[PDB]
Amino acid sequence: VLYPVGRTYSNITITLEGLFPHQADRGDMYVYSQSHKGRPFISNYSLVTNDFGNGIVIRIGSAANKTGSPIISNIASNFQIMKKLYPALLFGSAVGKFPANNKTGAYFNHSLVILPEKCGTVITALYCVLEPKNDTNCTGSSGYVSYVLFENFSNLKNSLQQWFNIKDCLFEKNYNVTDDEREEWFGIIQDQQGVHLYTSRKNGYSNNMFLFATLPIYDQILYYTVMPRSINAYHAFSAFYIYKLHKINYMVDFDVNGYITRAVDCGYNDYTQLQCSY
Amino acid sequence: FIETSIQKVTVDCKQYVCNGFERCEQLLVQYGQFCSKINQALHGVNLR
Amino acid sequence: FIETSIQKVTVDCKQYVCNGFERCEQLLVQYGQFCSKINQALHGVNLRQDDATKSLFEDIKVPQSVPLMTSLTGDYNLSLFEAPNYRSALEDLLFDKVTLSDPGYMKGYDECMKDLICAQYVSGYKVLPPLYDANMEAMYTASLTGSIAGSFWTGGLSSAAALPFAQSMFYRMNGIGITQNVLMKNQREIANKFNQALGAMQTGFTATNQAFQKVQDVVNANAQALSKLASELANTFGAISASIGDILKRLDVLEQEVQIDRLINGRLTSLNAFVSQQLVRSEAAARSSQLAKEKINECVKAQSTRSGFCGQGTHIVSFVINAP
Amino acid sequence: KLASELANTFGAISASIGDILKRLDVLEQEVQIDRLINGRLTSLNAFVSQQLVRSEAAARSSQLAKEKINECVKAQSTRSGFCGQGTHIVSFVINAPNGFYFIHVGYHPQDYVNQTAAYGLCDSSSKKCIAAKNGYFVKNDSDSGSWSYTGSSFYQPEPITTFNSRFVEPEVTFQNLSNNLPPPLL
Amino acid sequence: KLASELANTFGAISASIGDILKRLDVLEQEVQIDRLINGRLTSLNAFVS
Amino acid sequence: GQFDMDSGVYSASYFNARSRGYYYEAAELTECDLDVLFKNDAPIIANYSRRVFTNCNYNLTKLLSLVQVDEFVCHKTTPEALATGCYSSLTVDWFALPFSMKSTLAIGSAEAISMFNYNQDYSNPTCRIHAAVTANVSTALNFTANANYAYISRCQGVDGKPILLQPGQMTNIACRSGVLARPSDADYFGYSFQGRNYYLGRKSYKPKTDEGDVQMVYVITPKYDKGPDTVCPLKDLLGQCIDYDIHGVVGRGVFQVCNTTGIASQIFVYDGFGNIIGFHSKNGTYYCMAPCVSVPVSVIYDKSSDVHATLYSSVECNHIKSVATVFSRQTNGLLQTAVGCVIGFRNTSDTVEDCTLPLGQSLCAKPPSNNTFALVHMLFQNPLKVSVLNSTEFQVSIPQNFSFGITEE
Ligand SMILES: *[C@@H]1O[C@H](CO)[C@@H](O[C@@H]2O[C@H](CO)[C@@H](O[C@@H]3O[C@H](CO)[C@@H](O)[C@H](O)[C@@H]3O)[C@H](O)[C@H]2NC(C)=O)[C@H](O)[C@H]1NC(C)=O
Ligand SMILES: *[C@@H]1O[C@H](CO)[C@@H](O[C@@H]2O[C@H](CO)[C@@H](O[C@@H]3O[C@H](CO)[C@@H](O)[C@H](O)[C@@H]3O)[C@H](O)[C@H]2NC(C)=O)[C@H](O)[C@H]1NC(C)=O
Ligand SMILES: Nc1nc(=O)c2nc(CNc3ccc(C(=O)N[C@@H](CCC(=O)O)C(=O)O)cc3)cnc2[nH]1
Ligand SMILES: *[C@@H]1O[C@H](CO)[C@@H](O[C@@H]2O[C@H](CO)[C@@H](O)[C@H](O)[C@H]2NC(C)=O)[C@H](O)[C@H]1NC(C)=O
Ligand SMILES: CCCCC/C=C\C/C=C\CCCCCCCC(=O)O
Ligand SMILES: *[C@@H]1O[C@H](CO)[C@@H](O)[C@H](O)[C@H]1NC(C)=O
Ligand SMILES: *[C@@H]1O[C@H](CO)[C@@H](O)[C@H](O)[C@H]1NC(C)=O
Ligand SMILES: *[C@@H]1O[C@H](CO)[C@@H](O)[C@H](O)[C@H]1NC(C)=O
Ligand SMILES: *[C@@H]1O[C@H](CO)[C@@H](O)[C@H](O)[C@H]1NC(C)=O
Ligand SMILES: *[C@@H]1O[C@H](CO)[C@@H](O)[C@H](O)[C@H]1NC(C)=O
Ligand SMILES: *[C@@H]1O[C@H](CO)[C@@H](O)[C@H](O)[C@H]1NC(C)=O
Ligand SMILES: *[C@@H]1O[C@H](CO)[C@@H](O)[C@H](O)[C@H]1NC(C)=O
Ligand SMILES: *[C@@H]1O[C@H](CO)[C@@H](O)[C@H](O)[C@H]1NC(C)=O
Ligand SMILES: *[C@@H]1O[C@H](CO)[C@@H](O)[C@H](O)[C@H]1NC(C)=O
Ligand SMILES: *[C@@H]1O[C@H](CO)[C@@H](O)[C@H](O)[C@H]1NC(C)=O
Ligand SMILES: *[C@@H]1O[C@H](CO)[C@@H](O)[C@H](O)[C@H]1NC(C)=O
């Protein structure tokens, strides 16, 4: 649930209107894996392009401190505690295929690349164009399969530049976050006033979603992908789920500190419709 | 003859006012909050 | 429960429609002369309610009452109707168990300075005090309760008698149709049944009791009427804003005329709906007041010889309790 | 109200159709005549709703008038409060400009005196037990065993006869007289 | 009477929302739908009274 | 509305509190550069430019001194408001278009400009400004119009169904790039954009005049949202109804030192009706707000004595002083009463059972005939007591005299 912008409430029930997701919507699941043999181990994520629509919201982490399966090792003796990873996101307007190999996810023209740089302490929203680099067995060749933002274990822009060309670059914005192992929410919308980002690392210790970083991007985002990410070596990491926002009515309630504790889908069944009716 | 009971009628205010048009529904919720009061009063008379 | 009095509300039409803005006041006096008619009608309603309250409390008045009847009984326990204020214990129970907010009088405005109680001084309406204090109504009810000792008997309200409650109940049941032998045989079982019936009556103020829910629904209907009056100042009625000040800040004079005109039309419609609802509730209150007079003079001041009146079964004795 | 509400402009430039037709163009005339039409239709609807409410009130009062004529006027009422204050004696009807005007004559006492009474009287020897009808058995002022009959609505000590007492089944709460029995018990 | 007030234009070009959305621009659509809304709410309030 | 009135406890008009002071906060917002409108080359209608301004101030006298406005079209605002009032955010869409074709930007137009190049959004307040930058101002600045100006007359897929432009969105990049790539006018020409074919149209125009004046169109979208209003033009006490302007939000209300509620980051705390019930400020203190309320006034008048009294309903008389300047030009006789304290009345212990001027809870107003009323209580006439005898006898109260009482209805 996105927090109302510019204002707050306390112990009031309001029927807000905006971009809200459906109740019991099983969002798309994405996991990042460790290196298998000294080479990146990734999924089908880079060659599939989803629909942005009205915006997406991401349940970040939400599975830490549990027993996790390394994707390269299903044996329960190799199972370990999940860690927290931040995804690499790529938003654009025109999508085709790279010319040399015919692989999808080319992302022509300007594009918003959201990268969790450093050791998960800065998130970078840089807005520019990715062109293939004429290098052997890489983006724009005959022996290319996918691109990985490959990292070590304790800047992904250098890996991105190892797989793409950074030109015509309009802004590069950095936002400071702390390294934690917690549930977080991340959300992106686009309106006439630009691209608005939402996060849960604002104010005191809640799952709410406050606006920050109004980016000056005015061309309509139509597609998004999850750029695959791997960490060189057994280890296990959490998952993130992506849910789609819709133009629906939605009834929420606040508390003493001004946080939304409970909401109503207003259209999931007949009872929520009646609750909105009264 | 003694008329001891009324005809109990329930009217869906949003459907009656706007006939399922989304632009009309936006204009009606910008107009005010009337349909909930209509439903409450018209359910209270039926309960009575 | 019989709802004998409506909520008396006076609304200042100028403050409600225009909220002190002089441009709105000029547009409203160009619109018509609605406010004087609203004030006159809504004052006539309150005057009629006050007259109905006096006419109701003349019937409760008795020429003689026995102040020691409720305490000097036999095996009957009538402590729920003793005057110890003159408010009885059952009146206290009934007024405590109903979720009624305190109408501030004497110091309501001061408390609002530093809901629907504090919404009066910001919207434009005011809930008037009732014609009698609760204490004086308690005196009337206690005097009526003390007068039922011999009111049903051969003295037809021209004279008074001082029978104890046991003898009065004995005469009531006999005339009902139970022979005197049966009544004399059972002088303890009948009192025990009456006492346990009054005990279950005392405990029975729950959400299952129909009459207590009628009291709660009347209070809720009054609160809903006040909330409906107060919440229609936030409606735009098709304008850019529900506030006159934002319209005066943003728009030019010719468009300000249209926006203030549609706001004025919506608020006058709200006032007219409130006045018509008060008229309908006044007619309902008049009917219920006539029924209250009939039931007092038939059930409380006498014993009903007619079926279906004064409750189910066959009527023995009745008591009356003030409600909110 | 119905007559004077026609003078309202209702936000128009004038409250008259002719002035609007003379001054403004056709497109503006539509708007001004439309708001005047809306105001006057609202006035007619308000009048019809008021007429309906007063019609229900008049139906209730007509039922009350029928009940009060058939109880107060054609007969003498025994139910107090109804048919006026006090105990009803006689009532009359007078026509009124919009209804009827009733005049109820009622017995209103002025003075009161407290008296002692008995539920009934019995004779020790014969257990014959009498009870008063439409009155009480009050004690005499010059003896402790002499009982007199009095009316319910007036005070006058009278001798106890057969015509103002009824024979009833004996009760333990009756006075057991021994000497100076009244003629019904003698 | 409740059913027959859905055919009233109340001064608009048509009694149907679809015709108004098909013919007029957005700013006139607001005015016509507003007067239709006002008429239909008046009918509902009259029915409840 | 009459001059011969009758007796009764009427209800008078409310009297509203005035202003007892002024409060101002602005958070010291810097001037945002509106010179980017006149910095680079004038944009093409197809490739038009958009900027969003937040947390800034602007000097409008300097901005309107650089252009000559030919015609402005505003909806739900006026240019006077945008030079006086504050709002949440500002959006400026500017492009070069001559005045000979300004009817294409009019609402309802069937030209290709509205459906392929610029579709204006009317869900939020807007002003479309057709202005002309003169040649002398153009040389004073670096403002030029040397680009090849053309619009899109056709943006059609291989389906052949036109791709219309949604309101408040920039032009589709395929048709934009295809139109701006072609150097010559063509109504129908093919274009392959990154693997997909498009059939497009190009029609040219010239915004420059013979004098060298560049004719411009500015679309201004002031957004009025809840909360702080951080875009303001450059313009030159506890428990009291005072005027305020915390973050460009102007109004009146009563300020209290109050316990903190809500989130301190979001400045304004709202109710369920869009009313500000409090705000957070600098130095960490919280004030909760309420509109300044009005004293309810009732008038007691008697026709026989021609004496009027004034009841201030349910007010404690201490508080009258603070709002003592809001009543009529005559308003002392101070007296507390259970129905609210009143002026013009003497406190008496007399009780009358039937009164024609009831003040409320068992209270009356006795006529003078002095020159003032008397506060008298309603009388409960006690009935005659009858005592229960604890023996087989019982007490009766029998009348000794009577009178024929007439009641009429
Ligand atoms: C995995 O375990 C870590 C460490 O236990 C969890 O981080 C902890 O999350 C809790 C959330 O309740 C934090 O508690 C908070 O504490 C503040 C006071 O500092 C209090 O005001 C809040 O109401 C809340 O209770 C706790 O601080 C935090 N630990 C650290 C070191 O930051 C994490 O949530 C776990 N993740 C999962 C998915 O279970
Ligand atoms: C918005 O911008 C305009 C500029 O276009 C500002 O007008 C300028 O105001 C200053 C200050 O009053 C003027 O300076 C004065 O100049 C005289 C000599 O001419 C000098 O004697 C004074 O001491 C002072 O320095 C300046 O001339 C004037 N320029 C123009 C073109 O009007 C205006 O003040 C700005 N608005 C705001 C609210 O700041
Ligand atoms: N490498 C790795 N990555 C993972 O993400 C991972 N996740 C799990 C376990 N993940 C999950 C996810 C959902 C539910 C689940 O049952 N969901 C609840 C949600 C209930 C609610 O909506 O509140 C359900 O039953 O629907 C359980 C385990 C185990 N090993 C892993 N290993
Ligand atoms: C539409 O206009 C924008 C703004 O002028 C152009 O973006 C500029 O492009 C040049 C050349 O690539 C860069 O040197 C500038 O830095 C860009 N400026 C901005 C603000 O982005 C854009 O190229 C134009 N589109 C077309 C198709 O010509
Ligand atoms: C040659 C035009 C006049 C003759 C039209 C004759 C028949 C067409 C009938 C209706 C279509 C009229 C739309 C014209 C749009 C002009 C306004 C504009 O969008 O700029
Ligand atoms: C929160 O609001 C409720 C209203 O239902 C109220 O009862 C409660 O006291 C409020 N909490 C606080 C801390 O004031
Ligand atoms: C993998 O991605 C490709 C996209 O090229 C898609 O066609 C295929 O169905 C995907 N397979 C799975 C198992 O997701
Ligand atoms: C890509 O597709 C084209 C045409 O479909 C084909 O000629 C080319 O060989 C393909 N490339 C690869 C790597 O298969
Ligand atoms: C998108 O890219 C193509 C080629 O890479 C270019 O011709 C076109 O101008 C670009 N579009 C925009 C809007 O910059
Ligand atoms: C990981 O660290 C090693 C040792 O410094 C370095 O050679 C390698 O390039 C690093 N890889 C990444 C992905 O950072
Ligand atoms: C963000 O953190 C870095 C430390 O890596 C620091 O140098 C920088 O000043 C911080 N920026 C802000 C805006 O706090
Ligand atoms: C990954 O880790 C292994 C193990 O030390 C190392 O040999 C290899 O060079 C690393 N690769 C990268 C790219 O860091
Ligand atoms: C009478 O009833 C009241 C209330 O139930 C109780 O407190 C009291 O003890 C009872 N008295 C007798 C004598 O039973
Ligand atoms: C009237 O009351 C007084 C006082 O209680 C009593 O002494 C007197 O006997 C009573 N009158 C009669 C006739 O009993
Ligand atoms: C009267 O006599 C009867 C016995 O026949 C007795 O039961 C009753 O108690 C007596 N009542 C009196 C003494 O008044
Ligand atoms: C008015 O007089 C009565 C009786 O003398 C007294 O009880 C009351 O307190 C007085 N009012 C005030 C405000 O003192």
Author numbering:
A (entry chain C): 50 to 203, 211 to 289, 295 to 339
B (entry chain A): 775 to 822
C (entry chain C): 775 to 858, 866 to 895, 903 to 1112
D (entry chain B): 1016 to 1201
E (entry chain A): 1016 to 1064
F (entry chain B): 340 to 575, 586 to 680, 689 to 726, 735 to 774
From the paper:
Merbecoviruses from bats, pangolins, and hedgehogs pose significant zoonotic threats, with a limited understanding of receptor binding by their spike (S) proteins. Spike (S) protein is the major viral surface glycoprotein of MERS-CoV and forms homotrimers. For the MERS-CoV S-trimer, NTD is known to mediate cell adsorption by binding sialic acid, while RBD is known to bind the human dipeptidyl peptidase 4 (hDPP4) as the entry receptor. The S2 subunit mediates membrane fusion and exhibits a higher level of sequence conservation among CoVs.
In addition, S-trimer structures of six merbecoviruses from different animal species were determined. Different from previous MERS-CoV and MERSr-CoV PDF-2180 (31) S-trimer structures, densities that can be modeled as linoleic acids (LA) were identified in RBDs of most of the currently reported S-trimer structures, with CN-HedgehogCoV-locked-2 S-trimer being the only exception. Consequently, the identified fatty acid–bound 3-RBD “down” conformations for the merbecovirus S-trimers are also designated as locked conformations. In the characterized merbecovirus S-trimer structures, the putative LA carboxylate group interacts with a serine from a neighboring RBD via hydrogen bonds. In contrast, S-proteins of CN-HedgehogCoV, EU-HedgehogCoV, and SA-BatCoV are unlikely to bind sialic acid due to changes in key sialic acid–binding residues. Among our determined MERS-CoV S-protein structures, receptors for Japan-BatCoV, CN-HedgehogCoV, and EU-HedgehogCoV remain unidentified. The comparison of their RBD structures with MERS-CoV-RBD shows that the four conserved hydrophobic residues are either substituted with nonhydrophobic amino acids or displaced in position. To date, Japan-BatCoV (HKU5-HKU25 clade), CN-HedgehogCoV, and EU-HedgehogCoV (SA-BatCoV-HedgehogCoV clade) have not been shown to bind ACE2.
